[PDB]
Design a protein around this ligand. Structure first.
Ligand SMILES: Nc1ncnc2c1ncn2[C@@H]1O[C@H](COP(=O)(O)OP(=O)(O)OP(=O)(O)O)[C@@H](O)[C@H]1O
Ligand SMILES: [Mg+2]
Ligand SMILES: [Zn+2]
Lengths: 405, 127, 140, 70
């Protein structure tokens, strides 16, 4: 009877099991989300999630995790001195927007200075997988830069160790129906660009490593390198279209490409990434709203957009609870039809997880509904790089794993 | 096409919704020779479709997909020759249009399972 | 000696990386087997050069990109001085006016950024213009 | 009853509204097509179709349509 009553308006719904939820719970799910209510927080925590924007180097940046990452090194004598970079007042919800260079500097306790040791890398991978499975993620994509972690071992060795750690983590937690991993993790390599110095050779090395890794591991039920990223400093002189010749080989190989564009750049950088670098996903496309034609093109081309609300508020600053950076673009992106997702960016330095990200996404734009959250989940499911069979299995799992109110 | 797309905007009415790149094709008339001309069309935000694969290898299809930004491919019969390009077309969601009568008359295919090769419709559905 | 190989042509169920690793492992073990000559050095030292082959028609650019990426990764992987290493890349295959060296600059930009030696087949079936393009546009 | 019967295969179906079909009818929609059968031709003719590649300049070239255009 539930299916028969809601058989109409089914294709507008984001999933299949949404229909079997009674008129009362559908009306509840259409009401705007209230992040203050403990019931809403519990429901969001219990929701199965899909993660697309998570950096491996920004997990253990503050707190006891550092000690758990620090007390795993093969040679503790080589470890740098334990220094915790101070955070400004009210770090989760800072009163003033803060720049990007100090934002990168805040994660100095982890990354190159700490993940150079293989034991720390393995412990970081295990802790990140445990955090992801605790958050309820059924599918995540982790970005890493193996070439930054090489002194005597090749960056290929670093990538192989990272994938082996994630594979053993997946094999260990063989929960869930069908004998499948609780969370499936893929890899995306980051091509960092800096204001000055040597970075293009590192970008070429990362692209070659990504192509070789994608061609090496082809098991569908295994961690695979499924894409590349172009992150780092961005401005007029570091636009995406300066990197066509480096990326064309990737386009020869047939590898997914994700691009950071619009964090502190106008819509011109977004257009360059979309139409000259062929980005399949755009990270932090906050400046997409200025151009209507580009918004329509991104909508009809099915190009995903990844938004992290904590990072956007900390960097650009936004008004909370409807009280000049402009309104947060979640709602107009959702209304215009562009495929929009909510992610974590750096879990550690932001000191937040996916549940906090979704709750604060509701907080930033009043009027957001839980149906909008399910729509974001469907957008993340469609926009991720995965096989068609994996997409169907993830759709079935997420449809059958949404908790009742 | 750009002026017509800007002129008529009624959704419940006839509109010009895309441009085409048709005509005779060869090594000297690939899609990459029209990038500067199609830059304005991409800037205006209009759909683009291309003919490629009927009498040429997968390189023309790659050019139509990757530096002309085509959303659909016309008569991409050679796409089976390129596994990586086929996977890129599959994951990018780019549509491929096939005309059975035109392909049968022009290139020629075997009917009822009786060397142009096999018609790739079933394979294209499979991948 | 510098032996040129195309491991991507030998990959049907094992990766081209696995083929390259097997080739270099065979070369290194056969090196260590023949420990003749003074100073404890191998009798013959062989390094690898990856082949990027170009055809008259078909699909070969993806193969070229795969070979270049594999060569870069292999060069960064094995750095031991007294061992078999990948030392450069090649641009071989059919040659004419429409498959000269200067049509291949964009994917060789990554190899030049990485700092890897480049060698090109030129002058076999082309005039001095092809050699000029290889020398000055691809930096062989 | 039909829709509850075939609920678990809904994502495979291209259109949701055809999930209210019979198990026998759905089995009829799974075996290979027979272009020679008049029933299959009638069903294909009655199907709603979407067209994306049609040249206006090559429509009325022979038959009575040419004379009617002329
Ligand atoms: N929101 C963002 N916008 C732009 N660039 C970012 C953002 N978040 C991270 N980055 C950059 O992307 C890089 C990817 O992280 P990665 O794990 O490779 O580095 P890391 O270990 O933190 O070390 P390092 O930052 O010192 O290179 C980060 O180092 C940072 O430089
Ligand atoms: Mg860092
Ligand atoms: Zn990122």
């Amino acid at each position: 009877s539930r299916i028969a009553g809601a058989w109409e308006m089914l294709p507008e719904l984001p999933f299949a099991d949404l229909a079997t939820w009674s008129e009362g719970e559908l009306a509840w799910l259409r009401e705007p989300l209230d992040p203050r209510a403990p019931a809403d927080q519990r429901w969001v925590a219990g929701l199965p999630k899909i993660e697309l924007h998570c950096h491996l180097g920004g997990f253990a940046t503050h707190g006891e995790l550092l000690r758990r990452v620090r007390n795993a090194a093969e040679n503790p004598g080589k470890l740098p001195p334990l220094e915790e970079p101070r955070l400004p007042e009210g770090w989760p919800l800072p009163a003033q927007p803060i720049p990007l260079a100090e934002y990168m500097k805040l994660g100095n306790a982890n990354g190159t200075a700490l993940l150079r040791d293989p034991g720390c890398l393995r412990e970081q991978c295990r802790l990140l997988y445990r955090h992801l499975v605790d958050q309820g993620v059924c599918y995540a994509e982790v970005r890493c830069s193996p070439a930054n972690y090489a002194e005597v071992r090749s960056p290929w060795d670093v990538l192989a160790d990272i994938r082996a750690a994630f594979q053993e983590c997946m094999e260990g937690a063989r929960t869930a129906p069908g004998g499948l991993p609780a969370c499936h993790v893929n890899l995306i390599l980051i091509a960092t660009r800096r204001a000055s110095g040597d970075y293009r050779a590192a970008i070429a090395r990362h692209l070659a490593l990504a192509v070789t890794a994608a061609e090496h591991w082809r098991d569908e039920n295994a961690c695979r390198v499924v894409g590349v990223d172009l992150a780092g400093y961005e401005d007029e002189k570091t636009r995406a279209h300066y990197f066509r010749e480096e990326f064309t080989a990737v386009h020869r190989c047939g590898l997914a490409v994700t691009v950071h564009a619009g964090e502190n750049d106008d819509a011109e950088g977004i257009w360059r990434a979309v139409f000259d670098l062929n980005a399949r996903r755009l990270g932090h496309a906050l400046s997409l709203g200025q151009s209507r034609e580009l918004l329509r093109s991104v909508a009809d081309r099915g190009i995903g957009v990844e938004l992290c609300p904590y990072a956007n508020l900390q960097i650009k600053g936004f008004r909370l609870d409807g009280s000049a950076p402009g309104p947060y673009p979640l709602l107009d992106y959702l209304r215009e039809g562009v495929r929009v997702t909510v992610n974590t960016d750096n879990i550690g330095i932001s000191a937040a997880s996916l549940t906090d990200n979704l709750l604060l996404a509701a907080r930033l734009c009043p009027g957001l509904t839980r149906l909008d959250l399910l729509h974001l989940q469907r957008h993340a499911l469609e926009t991720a790089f995965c096989t068609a069979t994996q997409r169907l299995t993830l759709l079935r799992r997420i449809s059958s794993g949404i908790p009742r109110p």
